[PDB]
Amino acid sequence: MFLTRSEYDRGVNTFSPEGRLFQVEYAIEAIKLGSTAIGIQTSEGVCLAVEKRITSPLMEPSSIEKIVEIDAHIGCAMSGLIADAKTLIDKARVETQNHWFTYNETMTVESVTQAVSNLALQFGEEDADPGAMSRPFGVALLFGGVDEKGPQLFHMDPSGTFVQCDARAIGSASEGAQSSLQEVYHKSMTLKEAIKSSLIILKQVMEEKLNATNIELATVQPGQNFHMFTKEELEEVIKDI
Amino acid sequence: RYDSRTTIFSPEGRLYQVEYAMEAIGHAGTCLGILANDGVLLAAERRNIHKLLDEVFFSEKIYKLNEDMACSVAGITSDANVLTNELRLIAQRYLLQYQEPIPCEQLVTALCDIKQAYTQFGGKRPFGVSLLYIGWDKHYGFQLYQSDPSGNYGGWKATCIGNNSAAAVSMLKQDYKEGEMTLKSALALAIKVLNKTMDVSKLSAEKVEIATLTRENGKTVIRVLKQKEVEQLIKKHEEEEAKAE
Amino acid sequence: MFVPCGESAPDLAGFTLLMPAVSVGNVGQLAMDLIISTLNMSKIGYFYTDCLVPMVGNNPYATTEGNSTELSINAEVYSLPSRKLVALQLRSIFIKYKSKPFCEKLLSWVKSSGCARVIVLSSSHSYQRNDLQLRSTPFRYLLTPSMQKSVQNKIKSLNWEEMEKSRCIPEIDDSEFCIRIPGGGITKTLYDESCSKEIQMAVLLKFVSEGDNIPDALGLVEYLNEWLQILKPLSDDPTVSASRWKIPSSWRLLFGSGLPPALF
Amino acid sequence: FRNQYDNDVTVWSPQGRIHQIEYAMEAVKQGSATVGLKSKTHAVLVALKRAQSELAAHQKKILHVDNHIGISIAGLTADARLLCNFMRQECLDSRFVFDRPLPVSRLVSLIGSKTQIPTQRYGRRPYGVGLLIAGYDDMGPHIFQTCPSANYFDCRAMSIGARSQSARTYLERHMSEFMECNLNELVKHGLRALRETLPAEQDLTTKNVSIGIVGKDLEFTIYDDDDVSPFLEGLEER
Amino acid sequence: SYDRAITVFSPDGHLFQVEYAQEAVKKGSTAVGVRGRDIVVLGVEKKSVAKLQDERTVRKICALDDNVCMAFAGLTADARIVINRARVECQSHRLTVEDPVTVEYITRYIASLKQRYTQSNGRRPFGISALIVGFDFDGTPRLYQTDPSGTYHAWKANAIGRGAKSVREFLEKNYTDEAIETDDLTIKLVIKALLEVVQSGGKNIELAVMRRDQSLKILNPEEIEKYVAEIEKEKEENE
Amino acid sequence: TGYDLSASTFSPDGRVFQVEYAMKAVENSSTAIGIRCKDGVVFGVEKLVLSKLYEEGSNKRLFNVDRHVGMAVAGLLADARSLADIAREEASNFRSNFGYNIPLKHLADRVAMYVHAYTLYSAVRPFGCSFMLGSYSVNDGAQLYMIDPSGVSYGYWGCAIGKARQAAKTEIEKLQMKEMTCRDIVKEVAKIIYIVHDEVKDKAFELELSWVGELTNGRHEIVPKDIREEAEKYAKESL
Amino acid sequence: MSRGSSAGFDRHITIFSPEGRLYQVEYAFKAINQGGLTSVAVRGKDCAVIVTQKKVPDKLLDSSTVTHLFKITENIGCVMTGMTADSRSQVQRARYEAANWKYKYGYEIPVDMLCKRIADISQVYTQNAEMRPLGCCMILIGIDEEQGPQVYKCDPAGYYCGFKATAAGVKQTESTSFLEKKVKKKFDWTFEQTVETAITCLSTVLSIDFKPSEIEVGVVTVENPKFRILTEAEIDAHLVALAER
Amino acid sequence: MAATFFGEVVKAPCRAGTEDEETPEDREVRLQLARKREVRLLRRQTKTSLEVSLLEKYPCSKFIIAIGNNAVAFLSSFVMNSGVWEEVGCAKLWNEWCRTTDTTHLSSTEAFCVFYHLKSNPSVFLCQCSCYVAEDQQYQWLEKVFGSCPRKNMQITILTCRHVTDYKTSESTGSLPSPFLRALKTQNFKDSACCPLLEQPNIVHDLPAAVLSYCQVWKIPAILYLCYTDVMKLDLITVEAFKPILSTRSLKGLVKNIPQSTEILKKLMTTNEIQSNIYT
Structure with a gap:
C-alpha cells in the first residue's frame, strides 16, 4: 500500500533487517577506492605487489608508503584510507x-594479524571514553611473512576478520584481479614466476605504463628477511614484461 | 552541511556557526581604536542610552586588563565579561611566571586560542564577542589588536568593530595620517568617525566612551576621558565641520 | 498525463477532486485511503508519471474475493460519477528533485478536465506549532483566491482556523506574511502554483507527528466530513457504531510482521 | 508504520517489542549451519566452514575456550571473537581462584548477563553472534546455545545459522537415539544433520567441516581439515 | 550517507567532513614551496593586503625550529593551533632524542595530529594544509605537504590553496636541473610561479627562504626590495 | 505519537508512553500465577516448550533470589533474568549488613525502586518484565508482591501476569486462598493453569511449579516431582 | 551521550516556548491526575490532618499494603498523589534527606525545610536534558516546636507554599473552592471542626458518603506530635459522627 | 543519525522524506553530477546511437528479464544454455553502487543490464541485469529500453529476489518455508501463475516494480516473480526455487536440457566473487 524512507545505514550500531551493520560494510565500500594490491604466498616465499598511482611528477615516489616492514619477517600492503593504515x-x-x-622469540604472522584485528572491532563503544575510533577503519591489509609454519599470507578488512589467504587481491580492481588470479595461481610456484604472474595481472589492471616507478613490490622468504625491490631490480624484472 | 553543532563544515567549506557568530557583532555598539605616534585611544559607543541607568563607573565597554593594556568589547556582553575575566587572569599568570608585564601579542594569542578552541572540539556555543586591544610593551611599543569569534586576529593601525563597521573602516582608510599623527589629532579623527557612524541621534558625551593610553615617565596611563574634555572635543569638531562649509 | 482503464476519457466535466500530499505521517494519504474504502469508489484511471517511485500492490481496497487480484500501481485516480467525487491516490514517495514536474503536469491535467475543486488533505510537523497552536485545535485550512469567494461563508461559519502565516524571509522584518508549511510535501508548492493558475483549491490539514496515525486519520476524515458531508453527519450520538468508516482491506498488520518465537 | 521505533535499542515499539533485538537475530541467519548434538558421555560441534571466498582457507568456526568448554560461532565475527576472549578470561580466572574447571552452566549465565547489558543502554548494539557451547563438567555433557537477545537455552541438540531449520527438523526426528551412541555414531549423526542443510548438489568435503569433540575423558579437541577424514568417511549418500 | 557527522561513511565511502576540510583549503591564500639543491624556498601570496594592517601579525610563514619552517593555507586559527603544537613537539623531541628533529618526523607528527581529529564524532577536522620544508642534520633539503585527512606526501615543488593546480601544473614544466644549481636562480622560479596567480604585482607576496645551517630569513621589501628587484628581474629578462 | 521515543518525555495528556509499551510488552509472554495461602506461597507458569529439542528445564522462570524468597517472571527472559540477578544482590547485601534474612516487603521495595529508576532517563530503557516475589517466615507469615515494569509494588493475595492475566485473575477469584494449605493449593494452581491456557496457538507447554512456606521450612524450592505429577493428573481429569 | 534533546517546543524539558513556558513541567502536572485519586489536607491551630481516597479496583490485592500515606520521620508525614512509582521514590528521597538533616544539624528537620529541600531537588529535574519531573506532588504535615501546625505541598515544577488547608488530585479545583468557602466561614477546627471538615470536603466534592474502607487518615496534634494513621474503627467513628446528628 | 554531542536536537526523521530543503555554483555542479548519473544504451562496436528506444527498434514477442544476481544466475544457467544468444548491446549505468565504469570487457562471469536474443528468433529478448538501479534512473531506463509506443504483441516476464525478512505476514518470518515463490500479474495476463499471488500488505518497490507498472499502464500482459529467500547472496536452492517457472507456457519454448543447466549452476556458483567475509 505505502512506500517509506527507512534509514539504517546512517548511525553505527544499527542492524538493518537481514541483520547486517550497513555502517561497517560501508567501510568495506571504501577499499574500492585505494590502489590495487596483490599478494601471492608460495611455498618458496611470498611476494606483495601494489600499484602506487603517482599523481604528479613533482611527487617523490619514495614518499608514497604502500608496503611497510612490520618486522624483519612480516611485510604489509595497504589499500584505502592510508591515514588509518x-x-x-x-x-x-x-x-x-x-x-x-x-x-624471546619472533612473533608469528597469524598472531600479528590477530592483534591488528584486535585494534579493529572497537567501532562504537563511546561509553569507553579514551581515544576510540567511533567508526570502522578504512583500510584493507595484506600481512605477508614467514614463521614456524612456513610462509603465510593474511588478509584483513575493516571488519576485524582474517583468513590464512593466498592470492588475495585488494583495491579498486580487486575482484577482476582475483578472477585473473585463481586461474593463474598454482601451488608449486617458484617465487620468480609468482612475481611474473602478479606483475602481469597488475599490468592489465593499471592506468599508466608499467615501469619501476609506477609500482613497487617486496618479498620475504626463509633466506633473507624483509626485502624491498629497488628501481634497479624493478627494471631488472620488468625487462621481460 | 548546514547551521548546527558548531563543528560541521558545510559542503562549501564555510563554518556557518562562526559566520553567524560574526553576525551578533554587527548589532552591538560601534567601537573603534586608533594608533598614534605618542599614544593609543579606544573609543566606543555606549548604547545604554536609557536615562534611568546609573554607575557610569570607568566603563561599560572599556575594561582594563593589567597595568599596561586595556580592552574593549562588542557583542553578547556576558560572554564579553567572561573573556575579560579570562584575559585579566592570563595577564596575571604571565606576570607571575616571568615577573614582567605580558606583551600584548602574548595575551591576544592566548585568548584567541581559547576562542578558537570553542570553534572546534566542543558542542558548545562559540563566544560571540569581538574585542579590541590597546596596550604597550617594550618589544614593539604601542599596539592595537582585533579579534573575531572565529579566533582570528590581527594587528591594526586603525580599525573599528560593531555597528556601521564598513563605513567607519572605509572612512578610516581614506582618512588616516598613517605613521605621522599625534594623539589628539587622532582623537579628532575618532570624533569624525563616530560622527560618520551616528544613528539619527547626534552624539554627545552621554553616548560616547573614549579612553586613551599614554607613555609617560615610565608608567602607563589609562585615563577614561571625563565629561568636560569630551564635550569640548565635540564642540571642536563641530566648529571644524562648520567652517569646512 | 492521465491514462484510463477503458481507453476513453471519463470526461470529468465538473467533478470535485480530492488530493493527497506526501506529508509527515502520511496522514493525508491515509485519510483518503479511508474515504476511498468507505465510499466504495470505483477504479477508473491510472496516473502514470516519472515522478513517483514505482510500487505495485493488489487492490488494497479489496472488498471481495473476486477483485482481490486487481493490480494497483503507485498512482491511480478513483471516482464516483454519481456524487461528483473523484480522488487521486499517491501511495509511494517522491523522486528526488521531481516535485516540480509532477505538480504542474498534474495541474495541467486538472485544468484540462475542467474540474471544479482540488481539495487537498495534508499534514504538518507537530514541532512547527508554537504556543498558539498548542492551545488550539490541530486542524487548519487554506483557500485559494477562487476558493476565497465561493464557499467562503461555509468555511468560516463552520468555526475553522486559518493557516498560520510566518515571516517569508526571516532575514528581513519587512516581508509579507507568507506561506510556510513544512512536512506538507507538495502542499505549499501546489497551493502557490494554483494561486498562479487561479484555480479553485482547498487545503485541509492536521498538525501531526508520526506513529500509529489511525486516530489521526479518522480525525482528518471527520474534519473533511464537516464541510463535505460525504458520510451522513454524526447526528451527535452514534456512540456505538464507531465503524462508520470502511477499514480498507490493506489496513492489516502495520507495526511489522510478527513476534519472533524466541523472546517471550 | 513503525519506522520511528526500529532504530535504537532503547525504544520500545508501540506493540511491546524491541525491533533492534529482532534485527540482531537476523545476524545469526547470515552465518553458516552448525550443529551441536550430544550423547550421554560426549558432546560434539559439527560446523560447516564458509565456502564464500575461493583459494583462501575457510574461516574458523570452532574455537577452543578451555580444556572442557568449546564454542561454535554463527554470527558477526567481531562479536564472536569479542565474546570468546571474555569466555577465556572467565575460565582462566575460575581455574586461578578455585582451582577447578568452571562449570558450563555458570559460564553460560555469565554470558547471558554480559550480553544483556548492552541491550538496554543507549549507543550500543546487541552482540550479533549466536554461540554453540559444548562442555563437560561434573554433570556430564551440556549443549547451550546463545542468541543475540541475551537469552541462553539448554539444548540436547540445536543448529543455528543459514537454513538451520532443516537440521533442526532432522535432529528432532532423531533425538531419542542420541543418548546411547558411541563417538563414531554421534559424529555421523551430527554430520548428517549438517548435511541436510546443504543443497543436494554438494556433499560435505573434507575442506569445509570442522568437527570438535569434548566428553568424559577426551579434552575439547578441534579436528580441522584432512584430519576429519576418519569421522567423515563411511558417511552414506543421501 | 551524507556530508554530515564526520564519522559516517557514504554508501560509496567518502566520509565527507574530511572531504570538505579537504576543500576548505581552496579559499586560503595560495602557498608555494620549491626545494632547491642548497636552498628551500617558501612563498605565500597575501591578497588581503588591507593597507591599515600591521604586516607582521598576519604573517603566514611560521618557523617550527632552527631547521624547519612552515607555511599553510586555509583557516588561520587552526593553523596557529597546529603550529603551536608542532613547535612544542619539536622542542620535546629535542629534549628526549636530543638532535635537531628531522623534517620527516615533524611532518609525521603534524599529520598524526590532523588525523587524530578525524575519528571521534567529537572534534571537527583541521581545515588547513601545510608545506613543511627545511634542511635535515645529514644535510639534505626536504619538502612535505600535509592534508586535513592526514596524508603527508613529500614533494619536490608544491602549491596549495587558491589556484592549486594552476600553480602546480605551471610548475610541472619548469622544475629542472637548471633551476636549482644556483640560489637566486631557485628564487626566481617561485617568484614567477606566484606571479602566475599573483594579484598583479608584488602585493605582500610574503616570501621566506632558508639556506643551510643558518636560519629562516624572511625576505622583506628591503631598501632594494629584492621582492620587486626580482619582479622586474624576470619582467626585464623575459625578452 | 511523537511523545513516545524516550522515557524522559511526558505526553500532552500526561502519560509516559515508553513505560506503557513495556507494561504492554509483558502481554507477549506466557502467563505466570502465584497464590498465597495459610502456610506459604506457590507459583506456577505456563512455560512454553519452544521446540522438543530443549532440555526439560531450559528457560526457567522460577528463579530463587534467596533462601526464603522466590521469583516468577513474565516478559523478556533476558531482562527478567537480569532483575532476578539484581534481587539476588539485594538479599546478599542485606544479610551482610544486618545479619538476618532480608524481609520480603523490604526486598520488593528495594527492587521496585530500581525498575522505576530505569523509567525516568533518556539513556536507558525501562525493563520489559513483571515478576512476583514470594516468601514465608514464622515472624510474618507468607507474603506475595508484584512489580510491574513501571515500578509499582503492591502485595497480593492472588496474582497473575502474562498474556492471559484477565482469565487467570477471574479463575483465581474462585478460591478461598486464605483458608487453604499449599498441599490443596497446588492442585488448584494446576487447574487454573490448564483452564487459562489457550491450546490452539501454544501446544507443548511445560507446567512448572514451586512453593515456599511452612511445609518446606520456609525455604524456596521447586516442587518435588511426584507432587507435580499428581497435580498434572488432577488438572487433567478436571479437563 | 544521551539520546539528544527531542526537537520541539513541547518535545523536551529544558527547551523554552516562545513566551517562555516550560511544557514538560505542565504535562507533569497533568500527570498527577493519572490514577483518579485525590487528596485533601487541612489544619486547625493544634492539629494537621491529611485524608485521601483508597481505591482498590480488585479484591485479590492486599488492601493492607496498598496505601498513599507514608511516614517520612516520626513527626513528619506525607500523602502522595500521582504516578505511584515516582511517588514512592520521592518518599525515599524525603526520608533520606530528613534523616541526613538530623545527622548534620542535630535536631529534627522542620517541615518547611524538608519541603524546601525536596522542592529544590525536584526543580533540578526541570533543568537538565534527560531527567524527568516526578509526576507526583507531596503534601507534608507536622509540628516543629513553635512555628505552629504546618501543611505544605511540593509539585513537579519545584514550587512549594504554605497552606491553611490544601488539596491535590483530580477533583482538586472543586475541592479548592469548597475548602476556600470552609476557611472563609469558620476556622477554629480544634480536632473535630477538623477531620469532619476534610472528610466533608472530600465527599461533597467527590460522591456520596464514604465508608471506612476507602479512607486513609493521618493526623499530628500539638500534644501528640507523632504521625498516627487512624485505624478502620475510629475513621468509621468519625463517619457516623457525620451521619450521627 | 543525530545526537552527536550531549543535548543536541535530533529532528526525528520523516518516513515520507519531506526533509529535503525544497547560485551558479550549485546549478553547474548539479548539472554535471546529474550528467554523471545517466543510463546510456550502447550499440557496442558503435558504442552509441540508440536515441530511439531499443524495443522500438526491434520487434518483440516474448520478453524475459531478470533482476538480481540470483535471478541472473538462474536465467544464465536454466535458460541461457539451450540456444544461442547474441548481444544487441548493454546499458551503461553509474549510481551510488556498481561504480568505476561498471561496464567492462563483460568480465565473462559478470553482467550489468546486458541484453540478449535468440539465434533462431531474434524477436525474443532477454535483459540480464544484476545491478541496483536507483530511483532517479528507473524511469529513464524504462524509456530507453521500451519507448512510449509499446507494440502490444510482445509479452514480458520479470523475475527478482527479495529477502524473506521483508515479507509481511502475521506469523514470524522465521517460520515461513523460505525460499518461496509469489507472482504479480497485470490484469491482461490471462494465465494463472505457477505460484500463489502476492498478498495484500506486501509490496514491490524497485526497478522490477517500475517495469511491471509500465506494463500495467499500457495494457501490456506481464508477470512478476518473487523468490523470497532467506539468503540474498548466490546459492543453489535459492535459485532452484525458480524451478516451477520453467514449466509455464511463457518459457516452454526455451528449456531443453536440465542437467547441463545444473552443472552450469555448480560451476558459476563455485566461480563467483569474493564478497567480504564478515558473517554479516
Whole structure:
C-alpha cells in the first residue's frame, strides 16, 4: 500500500533487517577506492605487489608508503584510507616488539594479524571514553611473512576478520584481479614466476605504463628477511614484461 | 552541511556557526581604536542610552586588563565579561611566571586560542564577542589588536568593530595620517568617525566612551576621558565641520 | 498525463477532486485511503508519471474475493460519477528533485478536465506549532483566491482556523506574511502554483507527528466530513457504531510482521 | 508504520517489542549451519566452514575456550571473537581462584548477563553472534546455545545459522537415539544433520567441516581439515 | 550517507567532513614551496593586503625550529593551533632524542595530529594544509605537504590553496636541473610561479627562504626590495 | 505519537508512553500465577516448550533470589533474568549488613525502586518484565508482591501476569486462598493453569511449579516431582 | 551521550516556548491526575490532618499494603498523589534527606525545610536534558516546636507554599473552592471542626458518603506530635459522627 | 543519525522524506553530477546511437528479464544454455553502487543490464541485469529500453529476489518455508501463475516494480516473480526455487536440457566473487 524512507545505514550500531551493520560494510565500500594490491604466498616465499598511482611528477615516489616492514619477517600492503593504515601499522610494529620483548622469540604472522584485528572491532563503544575510533577503519591489509609454519599470507578488512589467504587481491580492481588470479595461481610456484604472474595481472589492471616507478613490490622468504625491490631490480624484472 | 553543532563544515567549506557568530557583532555598539605616534585611544559607543541607568563607573565597554593594556568589547556582553575575566587572569599568570608585564601579542594569542578552541572540539556555543586591544610593551611599543569569534586576529593601525563597521573602516582608510599623527589629532579623527557612524541621534558625551593610553615617565596611563574634555572635543569638531562649509 | 482503464476519457466535466500530499505521517494519504474504502469508489484511471517511485500492490481496497487480484500501481485516480467525487491516490514517495514536474503536469491535467475543486488533505510537523497552536485545535485550512469567494461563508461559519502565516524571509522584518508549511510535501508548492493558475483549491490539514496515525486519520476524515458531508453527519450520538468508516482491506498488520518465537 | 521505533535499542515499539533485538537475530541467519548434538558421555560441534571466498582457507568456526568448554560461532565475527576472549578470561580466572574447571552452566549465565547489558543502554548494539557451547563438567555433557537477545537455552541438540531449520527438523526426528551412541555414531549423526542443510548438489568435503569433540575423558579437541577424514568417511549418500 | 557527522561513511565511502576540510583549503591564500639543491624556498601570496594592517601579525610563514619552517593555507586559527603544537613537539623531541628533529618526523607528527581529529564524532577536522620544508642534520633539503585527512606526501615543488593546480601544473614544466644549481636562480622560479596567480604585482607576496645551517630569513621589501628587484628581474629578462 | 521515543518525555495528556509499551510488552509472554495461602506461597507458569529439542528445564522462570524468597517472571527472559540477578544482590547485601534474612516487603521495595529508576532517563530503557516475589517466615507469615515494569509494588493475595492475566485473575477469584494449605493449593494452581491456557496457538507447554512456606521450612524450592505429577493428573481429569 | 534533546517546543524539558513556558513541567502536572485519586489536607491551630481516597479496583490485592500515606520521620508525614512509582521514590528521597538533616544539624528537620529541600531537588529535574519531573506532588504535615501546625505541598515544577488547608488530585479545583468557602466561614477546627471538615470536603466534592474502607487518615496534634494513621474503627467513628446528628 | 554531542536536537526523521530543503555554483555542479548519473544504451562496436528506444527498434514477442544476481544466475544457467544468444548491446549505468565504469570487457562471469536474443528468433529478448538501479534512473531506463509506443504483441516476464525478512505476514518470518515463490500479474495476463499471488500488505518497490507498472499502464500482459529467500547472496536452492517457472507456457519454448543447466549452476556458483567475509 505505502512506500517509506527507512534509514539504517546512517548511525553505527544499527542492524538493518537481514541483520547486517550497513555502517561497517560501508567501510568495506571504501577499499574500492585505494590502489590495487596483490599478494601471492608460495611455498618458496611470498611476494606483495601494489600499484602506487603517482599523481604528479613533482611527487617523490619514495614518499608514497604502500608496503611497510612490520618486522624483519612480516611485510604489509595497504589499500584505502592510508591515514588509518598509519595507526594500524604502528599497532602492528608495537605489538611485534612487545611480544619479542616479553617472549624471546619472533612473533608469528597469524598472531600479528590477530592483534591488528584486535585494534579493529572497537567501532562504537563511546561509553569507553579514551581515544576510540567511533567508526570502522578504512583500510584493507595484506600481512605477508614467514614463521614456524612456513610462509603465510593474511588478509584483513575493516571488519576485524582474517583468513590464512593466498592470492588475495585488494583495491579498486580487486575482484577482476582475483578472477585473473585463481586461474593463474598454482601451488608449486617458484617465487620468480609468482612475481611474473602478479606483475602481469597488475599490468592489465593499471592506468599508466608499467615501469619501476609506477609500482613497487617486496618479498620475504626463509633466506633473507624483509626485502624491498629497488628501481634497479624493478627494471631488472620488468625487462621481460 | 548546514547551521548546527558548531563543528560541521558545510559542503562549501564555510563554518556557518562562526559566520553567524560574526553576525551578533554587527548589532552591538560601534567601537573603534586608533594608533598614534605618542599614544593609543579606544573609543566606543555606549548604547545604554536609557536615562534611568546609573554607575557610569570607568566603563561599560572599556575594561582594563593589567597595568599596561586595556580592552574593549562588542557583542553578547556576558560572554564579553567572561573573556575579560579570562584575559585579566592570563595577564596575571604571565606576570607571575616571568615577573614582567605580558606583551600584548602574548595575551591576544592566548585568548584567541581559547576562542578558537570553542570553534572546534566542543558542542558548545562559540563566544560571540569581538574585542579590541590597546596596550604597550617594550618589544614593539604601542599596539592595537582585533579579534573575531572565529579566533582570528590581527594587528591594526586603525580599525573599528560593531555597528556601521564598513563605513567607519572605509572612512578610516581614506582618512588616516598613517605613521605621522599625534594623539589628539587622532582623537579628532575618532570624533569624525563616530560622527560618520551616528544613528539619527547626534552624539554627545552621554553616548560616547573614549579612553586613551599614554607613555609617560615610565608608567602607563589609562585615563577614561571625563565629561568636560569630551564635550569640548565635540564642540571642536563641530566648529571644524562648520567652517569646512 | 492521465491514462484510463477503458481507453476513453471519463470526461470529468465538473467533478470535485480530492488530493493527497506526501506529508509527515502520511496522514493525508491515509485519510483518503479511508474515504476511498468507505465510499466504495470505483477504479477508473491510472496516473502514470516519472515522478513517483514505482510500487505495485493488489487492490488494497479489496472488498471481495473476486477483485482481490486487481493490480494497483503507485498512482491511480478513483471516482464516483454519481456524487461528483473523484480522488487521486499517491501511495509511494517522491523522486528526488521531481516535485516540480509532477505538480504542474498534474495541474495541467486538472485544468484540462475542467474540474471544479482540488481539495487537498495534508499534514504538518507537530514541532512547527508554537504556543498558539498548542492551545488550539490541530486542524487548519487554506483557500485559494477562487476558493476565497465561493464557499467562503461555509468555511468560516463552520468555526475553522486559518493557516498560520510566518515571516517569508526571516532575514528581513519587512516581508509579507507568507506561506510556510513544512512536512506538507507538495502542499505549499501546489497551493502557490494554483494561486498562479487561479484555480479553485482547498487545503485541509492536521498538525501531526508520526506513529500509529489511525486516530489521526479518522480525525482528518471527520474534519473533511464537516464541510463535505460525504458520510451522513454524526447526528451527535452514534456512540456505538464507531465503524462508520470502511477499514480498507490493506489496513492489516502495520507495526511489522510478527513476534519472533524466541523472546517471550 | 513503525519506522520511528526500529532504530535504537532503547525504544520500545508501540506493540511491546524491541525491533533492534529482532534485527540482531537476523545476524545469526547470515552465518553458516552448525550443529551441536550430544550423547550421554560426549558432546560434539559439527560446523560447516564458509565456502564464500575461493583459494583462501575457510574461516574458523570452532574455537577452543578451555580444556572442557568449546564454542561454535554463527554470527558477526567481531562479536564472536569479542565474546570468546571474555569466555577465556572467565575460565582462566575460575581455574586461578578455585582451582577447578568452571562449570558450563555458570559460564553460560555469565554470558547471558554480559550480553544483556548492552541491550538496554543507549549507543550500543546487541552482540550479533549466536554461540554453540559444548562442555563437560561434573554433570556430564551440556549443549547451550546463545542468541543475540541475551537469552541462553539448554539444548540436547540445536543448529543455528543459514537454513538451520532443516537440521533442526532432522535432529528432532532423531533425538531419542542420541543418548546411547558411541563417538563414531554421534559424529555421523551430527554430520548428517549438517548435511541436510546443504543443497543436494554438494556433499560435505573434507575442506569445509570442522568437527570438535569434548566428553568424559577426551579434552575439547578441534579436528580441522584432512584430519576429519576418519569421522567423515563411511558417511552414506543421501 | 551524507556530508554530515564526520564519522559516517557514504554508501560509496567518502566520509565527507574530511572531504570538505579537504576543500576548505581552496579559499586560503595560495602557498608555494620549491626545494632547491642548497636552498628551500617558501612563498605565500597575501591578497588581503588591507593597507591599515600591521604586516607582521598576519604573517603566514611560521618557523617550527632552527631547521624547519612552515607555511599553510586555509583557516588561520587552526593553523596557529597546529603550529603551536608542532613547535612544542619539536622542542620535546629535542629534549628526549636530543638532535635537531628531522623534517620527516615533524611532518609525521603534524599529520598524526590532523588525523587524530578525524575519528571521534567529537572534534571537527583541521581545515588547513601545510608545506613543511627545511634542511635535515645529514644535510639534505626536504619538502612535505600535509592534508586535513592526514596524508603527508613529500614533494619536490608544491602549491596549495587558491589556484592549486594552476600553480602546480605551471610548475610541472619548469622544475629542472637548471633551476636549482644556483640560489637566486631557485628564487626566481617561485617568484614567477606566484606571479602566475599573483594579484598583479608584488602585493605582500610574503616570501621566506632558508639556506643551510643558518636560519629562516624572511625576505622583506628591503631598501632594494629584492621582492620587486626580482619582479622586474624576470619582467626585464623575459625578452 | 511523537511523545513516545524516550522515557524522559511526558505526553500532552500526561502519560509516559515508553513505560506503557513495556507494561504492554509483558502481554507477549506466557502467563505466570502465584497464590498465597495459610502456610506459604506457590507459583506456577505456563512455560512454553519452544521446540522438543530443549532440555526439560531450559528457560526457567522460577528463579530463587534467596533462601526464603522466590521469583516468577513474565516478559523478556533476558531482562527478567537480569532483575532476578539484581534481587539476588539485594538479599546478599542485606544479610551482610544486618545479619538476618532480608524481609520480603523490604526486598520488593528495594527492587521496585530500581525498575522505576530505569523509567525516568533518556539513556536507558525501562525493563520489559513483571515478576512476583514470594516468601514465608514464622515472624510474618507468607507474603506475595508484584512489580510491574513501571515500578509499582503492591502485595497480593492472588496474582497473575502474562498474556492471559484477565482469565487467570477471574479463575483465581474462585478460591478461598486464605483458608487453604499449599498441599490443596497446588492442585488448584494446576487447574487454573490448564483452564487459562489457550491450546490452539501454544501446544507443548511445560507446567512448572514451586512453593515456599511452612511445609518446606520456609525455604524456596521447586516442587518435588511426584507432587507435580499428581497435580498434572488432577488438572487433567478436571479437563 | 544521551539520546539528544527531542526537537520541539513541547518535545523536551529544558527547551523554552516562545513566551517562555516550560511544557514538560505542565504535562507533569497533568500527570498527577493519572490514577483518579485525590487528596485533601487541612489544619486547625493544634492539629494537621491529611485524608485521601483508597481505591482498590480488585479484591485479590492486599488492601493492607496498598496505601498513599507514608511516614517520612516520626513527626513528619506525607500523602502522595500521582504516578505511584515516582511517588514512592520521592518518599525515599524525603526520608533520606530528613534523616541526613538530623545527622548534620542535630535536631529534627522542620517541615518547611524538608519541603524546601525536596522542592529544590525536584526543580533540578526541570533543568537538565534527560531527567524527568516526578509526576507526583507531596503534601507534608507536622509540628516543629513553635512555628505552629504546618501543611505544605511540593509539585513537579519545584514550587512549594504554605497552606491553611490544601488539596491535590483530580477533583482538586472543586475541592479548592469548597475548602476556600470552609476557611472563609469558620476556622477554629480544634480536632473535630477538623477531620469532619476534610472528610466533608472530600465527599461533597467527590460522591456520596464514604465508608471506612476507602479512607486513609493521618493526623499530628500539638500534644501528640507523632504521625498516627487512624485505624478502620475510629475513621468509621468519625463517619457516623457525620451521619450521627 | 543525530545526537552527536550531549543535548543536541535530533529532528526525528520523516518516513515520507519531506526533509529535503525544497547560485551558479550549485546549478553547474548539479548539472554535471546529474550528467554523471545517466543510463546510456550502447550499440557496442558503435558504442552509441540508440536515441530511439531499443524495443522500438526491434520487434518483440516474448520478453524475459531478470533482476538480481540470483535471478541472473538462474536465467544464465536454466535458460541461457539451450540456444544461442547474441548481444544487441548493454546499458551503461553509474549510481551510488556498481561504480568505476561498471561496464567492462563483460568480465565473462559478470553482467550489468546486458541484453540478449535468440539465434533462431531474434524477436525474443532477454535483459540480464544484476545491478541496483536507483530511483532517479528507473524511469529513464524504462524509456530507453521500451519507448512510449509499446507494440502490444510482445509479452514480458520479470523475475527478482527479495529477502524473506521483508515479507509481511502475521506469523514470524522465521517460520515461513523460505525460499518461496509469489507472482504479480497485470490484469491482461490471462494465465494463472505457477505460484500463489502476492498478498495484500506486501509490496514491490524497485526497478522490477517500475517495469511491471509500465506494463500495467499500457495494457501490456506481464508477470512478476518473487523468490523470497532467506539468503540474498548466490546459492543453489535459492535459485532452484525458480524451478516451477520453467514449466509455464511463457518459457516452454526455451528449456531443453536440465542437467547441463545444473552443472552450469555448480560451476558459476563455485566461480563467483569474493564478497567480504564478515558473517554479516
